[PDB]
Amino acid sequence: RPTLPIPDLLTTDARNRIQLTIGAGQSTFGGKTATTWGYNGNLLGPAVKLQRGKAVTVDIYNQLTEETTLHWHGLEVPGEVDGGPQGIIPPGGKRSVTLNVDQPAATCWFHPHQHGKTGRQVAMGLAGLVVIEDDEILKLMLPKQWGIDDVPVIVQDKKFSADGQIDYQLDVMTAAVGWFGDTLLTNGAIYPQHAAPRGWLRLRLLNGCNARSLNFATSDNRPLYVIASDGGLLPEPVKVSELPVLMGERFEVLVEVNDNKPFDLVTLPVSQMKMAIAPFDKPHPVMRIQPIAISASGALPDTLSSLPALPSLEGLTVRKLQLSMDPMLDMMGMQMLMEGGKFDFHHANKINGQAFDMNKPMFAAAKGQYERWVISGVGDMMLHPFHIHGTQFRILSENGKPPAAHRAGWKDTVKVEGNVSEVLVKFNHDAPKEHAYMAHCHLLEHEDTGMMLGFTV
Ligand SMILES: [Cu+2]
Ligand SMILES: [Cu+2]
Ligand SMILES: [Cu+2]
Ligand SMILES: [Cu+2]
Ligand SMILES: [Cu+2]
Ligand SMILES: [Cu+2]
Ligand SMILES: [Cu+2]
C-alpha cells in the first residue's frame, strides 16, 4: 500500500504571515491522471497551525481560472475574515485576512464557499485543515507528534470517469441526494498505510465528502477513544466501538497500538433511509495502521477538559428554522434509492420558505448571548447535517433526542434527518450585512441549491 500522505503543518513565517496558493494541478488515482485543485499543491492542502490568543495574517492567492472564497469552518471569527461579496477572490486576485483565535483547542478545516459552486470546488480537491492549540491541551501529554502519532485523516469519495478525470455534475439528481463516488480517498490516497509506534495513536478524523456519511471503526473491533469533537476536547474520553461522522464534522480519537498486530481503520455501511443492511453491504477499509517497535510517549488522561454547564433555557431567544426540499427532488431521490415542469432547481431547497439570497439576511442574532435554535426537517426524510458559522454550540436535542455523550460537547454541526434538532448558540463577534454569517446544510449540493440563510450579529 502507498504510505499515508501527511499535510504540511504550516506556522507563521518571520513576518507573521501564512501563504496559501489556490492552484490547479495534476494528481494520480489508481494509475490514471486527473486534474485536481489544491492549496499550496495539487490536492487538498496544508494544516494551518494556530495559537489561541494570538493573531496571524493569511495571504490567499487565487491562481485558478474562476472565482472562489475561503471559509474557515469552525473558527469563531468576525464575518469579515470569510467576507461576504468582499470575500470573493477573482482569478489572479489576492486577499488578506487577519485571524484572531480566541476559542479552545480544536481541529477545524477550511474549504471554498462560492455561491452555487461549493460542491464542485470541494469535489475538485480544495480542502485544508486548521489545528488550534491553547495552553490547556499542551499540558495533557496527548500524542502530539505530527505525522507520526498525531495524524490527520481526511476521508473523501470521488467519482472518476473512464478517462480518469473527476466527474462532477450539479444536475437535477445530485441536487437531491448529493454527489457520490465509488473511490474512497484518505488524504488523497487510495487505502494508504501509516506506520505508527507502539502506544497511543491519535487520529484527527474529517469527513470531507460532499454527501456521504461515514461510520468509523477498526477491523478487529478494538475501541476508539473519542477525545474531541468539532469544537474541541470533551470533558473525558468517550469510548466507542464505531463513530458516525457527518459531512464536515471532525472528531479526534485515540486508538491503541499495543502489538505488532496491524489493523485497518474502516468505515461501516450507513443506513440510507432508516433501512436494513444485507451482508453484501460490506465495511470498506480507510487506512492500514502498521505498528513499529518504537514506543510512543502519548497518554490518555482521565480528564481532558472542563466544559461549562448548559445555561438555563429561560430568557433565551428561540429562533425556528424549517428545512424543506422541492418535492420533485425528494421524490426522485427515493426512486433512485431502489433503482415535471419548467423547474429551476438552483433555488429549489429552502429554509423557512426562502431559498438563499446573498443580499437578504433572514435576521440578526444577539452578540454574546445564548440563543436557542430549533431546526426541523420534519417535512423531509433525508439527512441534513446543519452547520452554523461563527460559533461552537451545544446540542440540546439532536433529531429529537438528547445528544450522545461524545456529541454533547462543542459542535458546529447537528444532524437533522426527518425530525427536529435544538442547539444552544452564542456569537462573540460582529458580522454586518456585507459580511454576514451563514447557516446551512453541509450536504454541499443542498447548500448550492438554496438550503442556506445569512444572518447578522
Ligand atoms: Cu464547512
Ligand atoms: Cu467589510
Ligand atoms: Cu474572538
Ligand atoms: Cu460498498
Ligand atoms: Cu443564488
Ligand atoms: Cu440537506
Ligand atoms: Cu458554511
From Swiss-Prot:
Cofactor field: Cu cation
Name under which the protein is recorded: Multicopper oxidase CueO
Biotechnology: Triggering CueO activity at need by the addition of copper salts with minor toxic effects on E.coli cells could be used as a simple tool for biosynthetic purposes. The protein was also identified as robust host protein for use in biosensing and drug-screening applications.
Gene name as annotated: cueO
UniProt temperature dependence: Optimum temperature is 55 degrees Celsius with 2,6-DMP as substrate.
The enzyme's E.C. designation: 1.16.3.4
Superkingdom of source: Bacteria
GO biological process, one term: response to copper ion
pH note: Optimum pH is 6.5 with 2,6-DMP as substrate. The pH dependence of the reaction as monitored by oxygen consumption shows a broad activity peak between pH 5 and 6 and a second activity peak at pH 8.
